[model samples]
Target: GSFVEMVDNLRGKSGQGYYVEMTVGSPPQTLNILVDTGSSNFAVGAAPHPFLHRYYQRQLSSTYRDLRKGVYVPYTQGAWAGELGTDLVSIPHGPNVTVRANIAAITESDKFFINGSNWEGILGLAYAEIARPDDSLEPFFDSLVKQTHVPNLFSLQLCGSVGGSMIIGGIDHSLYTGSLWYTPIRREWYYEVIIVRVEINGQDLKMDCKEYNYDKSIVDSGTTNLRLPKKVFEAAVKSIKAASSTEKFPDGFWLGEQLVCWQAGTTPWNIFPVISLYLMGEVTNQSFRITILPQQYLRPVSQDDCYKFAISQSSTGTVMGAVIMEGFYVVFDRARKRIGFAVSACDEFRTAAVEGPFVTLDMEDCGYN
Candidate 1:
């Protein structure tokens, strides 16, 4: 049976993020969890909730079991810790797709729980090898593939921090446009892939192996912005600045951090450089060409002409986050161990203010629905 689940974007959150609703255990209790591809363990309000709300009550479920072993998983910002257990996990499907799987009920966590995070828990979509502490349990999706007729693929159609859909076991051709571009997964942990190099306005950057070549990057939907190594990011900033010379940052461009900004409405897209990431093993003609259009990279500061680029500098490995993912439909093909990308129909969706009444799913069909 085919499964489709809606992933909604949070309103008034600090940053753009998405979550999915799921029911866990018998006498089901529904909880909204972050759809993270970065980690593999499913965890809930492990720490005491500051606000009264429904969470996973192990005692309330008939099939819940205490594995007793403790697990700790770390993240870029914080961490989660808890004992592992197994229970019936259900997705909101036609008949509610349910599967018994190992879940980490958070016994402890950092600010992730108390900071109005909105999400009650996390639903990891990565493989088991990336699972916490021991990586001993199969992730929910992995189990689902083995126990059901569902395909070992999931597609994401993210709409600018507002909402999107996660097509389980299949792809909704209606959400994207053009042929799907494929790239091999260099590593299994977090959809890691190798880039032959990066090109800015048709000129390839100097990816010297020692100084700036972190040639590998992860396609992480869980993140809201793009992160590049210090050297590479610096070079990118210089290129953009050189291209858009007339746009001035009168107050001095630094934002007290790596993020750089300019007066909104003052900068125009025509002057911006088009950035492209060439896949390591692809032919010369094939590469992910991401044009740095003004609308995609600049965000309004709301007060003045201030707008900032969605790109940031990170000490960690390069991350192709939402900033670069917005206009594309990304597919995680775990079984074949490759990822696919195509332009999203979201442009039409945005312009029309809705996914209009009817539209045919096709790679070659270019008409707006």
Candidate 2:
């Protein structure tokens, strides 16, 4: 089957967030999609331009009718502009879990155009304060939660390791069978934590953002990058950089050279800062792994691409992607609007890095072992 056909195959499988995929006309152009628990809206990236827009617009023409106006999501990052188109897009096996959505049609950007799942856009589910009353996403998720739970509490269980899953509903206890810690709700959106102290490679770091204002550090499975607020991210990068031996890239970027890194050198300058997260009186020791994605991709680009590459004085915060969420199963309580974390594992696979191929997490054979 084509890659898009696979996405259409996994649509409505009694999951937490909606696993939405897009299409063109009747014949169907299946797109594998990752439902994002950290974002509120649903949109596709790397889709056709005016042609795709018009194609999706005509879905209603083939007994697929939805009454919703498209909206725009402006960005300074890249040329991919966002649109708000509505569709009754369904996965292969469907009881018709329909949603009125504004789909994004990518106009420019090669990253969004690549084939396979990586190229598709995101379906965000972060709970925010500012949204049109009718268009706000809280109600959408709330409805799904109510249907799924007495007050649905969903777990992300990102399986942060090399290969894992975005498990929904109750976490497979066997995954985190060893020890489980609890935490209180820091915010209503996603569960958040405070940084009492941080040091990387024995080096104290300075922060750019203020303290957590009941901020929610949601665990998102769809993204493979670690995103944070401006201040926290700045401190993290600085600490990581201070600890490692440096090298420069052709794009005028500099970074630490470590095959696989987690170091704590000194007290304030130590890489392993005594980082602890407060979760319902339970103190969980956390370590930062600076070797997730290639530093070149995450490093701050030039001033022209700063909006796409790095955080700055003005940014919309950040989402901790697969870079950090790997090898862990994150639990979210929809009723309480709280989240928790536990370490987990999965089957593993390896591949060379030429960029043409990637091994996605597949658990068809491993049944929650």
Q: Which of the numbered candidates is closest to the native, going by highest lDDT?
A: 1
lDDT, residue 346, model 1: 72
Candidate 2 residue-wise lDDT, 1-369, digit = tens = 112222222232211122444443344655545566654554554435432322233443363334344444433442244444444343343222333344444435533332322325554555544222234534344544444432355454332202233333344565453344444444555434332223343344433213322143445554444455556655665554444434322222322232221232211212212222222223333322121322212332111322122212224444445444443455666555455555544212321011111121221221111
Worst 10-residue stretch by lDDT in candidate 2?
Answer: 351-360
What's the C-alpha lDDT at position 136 in model 1? 68
User: What overall lDDT goes with each candidate model?
Assistant: 0.66, 0.38
TM-score (all chains, Cα) for each model:
0.81, 0.55
lDDT of 2 at 263: 31
* Poorest lDDT segment (10 consecutive residues) of candidate 1: 348-357
Steric clashes per prediction: 4, 48
